[PDB]
Nucleic acid binder design. Structure first.
Ligand SMILES: [Ca+2]
Ligand SMILES: [Ca+2]
Lengths: 255, 248
DNA sequence: CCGAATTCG
DNA sequence: CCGAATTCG
């Protein structure tokens, strides 16, 4: 990452299924091999557990880890050392979660710009649609509260169905979904796919765009450049790093 | 002056079913209504009614599984025809059962249904309600239309549906929303489902369309409120007894 | 047939 | 962690 790429932020967002203990160390090494290949500035992770933090400190030592909780399972934001200056951590609760979910925010400077970087793992399953929608509103409300000079990026596992974003009232006028921005490309549309991914061993074909990237920037100051899936290679154990595909995204920050 | 009972009699609950069926009819005997709208009837229950209620003409919504029925008191009600309207996307064999009848010079179209069940099937239930309301509008203006049945509705779903049309009224609302007969399915007062919690809903509803003011609800009461010898009620639902006057 | 929880496909 | 069918409190 040299002079030319200095105006770009690159990141990966990925629910890495830390609650599946089977093959977890090898699957962590798989995630870390992906981070080594693309060397993203930032990594947004969901379903991290404490042993997984240890694996990351070993196989992704060039990242500072900021976590959404101390025990159970939680999100984390990883920051590339020497590229990202960490300014503060903020955690916003979801008072009605039944699954210890919350909103993790990290304030940083990168490439000579101020960012508020957000992630969450919104309430899971169709049956908890109401709370998931309430949490999305909390997220979208927080994105709007940041100073107008700050660049806000949310990236996480939203567990959203399309009908739910409408029921939520659609995205506010100044908040954009990166996948939509890039013209809804088919190659990275689905991030959870039980036909293509066998980690859950579900004997049926269902697929969802659970993982999403939202951003709020002053008119034209933040331009998504690319969006691609990662984590599609089977590991030596014959499974994938996670039941989710990860998303690799690059964005330019423009005057 | 006409009377009727509408009641989901829970024919799919096999426990104490003979005693509960006899319990339902003991209740019908007490009030001897002109018309009875039933939901969740099963074939042997239907077979029972043809004997026990042999004094009623019995019209059914199906022959198999579970289904609705409309009983018409011979002498009082003249049966002219039955019509069944399908719900193409039902997953529960639900449909719309109508009968054309007269009492004196007064023509009626009487309708019942058991709308798609459970919170998860709200969207189909709403679609079925639109079909029902649509049908109510088709009758001649001189024909009095009454729907009475188990709608499984939540109030929000009626709103979602667009609300009742200007010329269709809910009898319970018309009577000023009396508290004593508001909830027709109540797990606190009713123990048949053995649900260890308190939920209550107004699932059973009466809708009518008449030329302005021709049909005036007079009373509405719950029935089936007494435990049977087995310590359970005739059904998990209360029945609704309604009396209305035809005013020309 | 409530909401929540559970197996198995 | 899908979703339909089933069981539980
Ligand atoms: Ca998971
Ligand atoms: Ca029933």
């Amino acid at each position: 990452k040299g002079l030319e790429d200095s105006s770009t932020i690159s990141f990966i967002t990925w629910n890495i299924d830390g609650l599946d203990g089977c093959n977890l160390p090898e699957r962590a090494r798989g995630v870390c091999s992906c981070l080594a290949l693309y060397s993203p500035d930032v990594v947004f992770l969901q379903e991290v557990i404490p042993p997984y933090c240890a694996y990351l400190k070993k196989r992704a030592a060039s990242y500072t880890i900021i976590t959404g909780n101390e025990e159970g399972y939680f999100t984390a934001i990883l920051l590339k050392k020497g590229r990202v200056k960490f300014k503060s951590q903020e955690i916003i609760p979801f008072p009605n979660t039944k699954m210890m979910r919350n909103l993790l925010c990290v304030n940083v400077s990168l490439g000579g710009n101020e960012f508020c970087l957000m992630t969450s793992h919104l309430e899971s399953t169709r049956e908890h649609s109401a709370e998931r929608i309430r949490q999305l509103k909390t997220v979208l409300g927080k994105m709007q509260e940041a100073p107008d000079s700050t660049t806000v990026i949310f990236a996480g596992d939203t567990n959203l169905r399309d009908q739910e974003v409408i029921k939520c009232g659609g995205l506010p006028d100044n908040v954009f979904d990166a996948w939509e921005f890039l013209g809804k490309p088919k190659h990275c549309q689905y991030t959870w796919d039980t036909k293509a991914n066998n980690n859950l061993r579900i004997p049926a074909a269902y697929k969802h765009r659970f993982d999403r990237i939202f951003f709020r920037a002053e008119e034209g100051h933040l331009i998504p450049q690319s969006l691609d899936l990662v984590g599609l290679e089977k590991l030596d154990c014959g499974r994938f790093p996670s039941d989710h595909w990860g998303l690799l995204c690059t964005l330019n920050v423009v005057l």
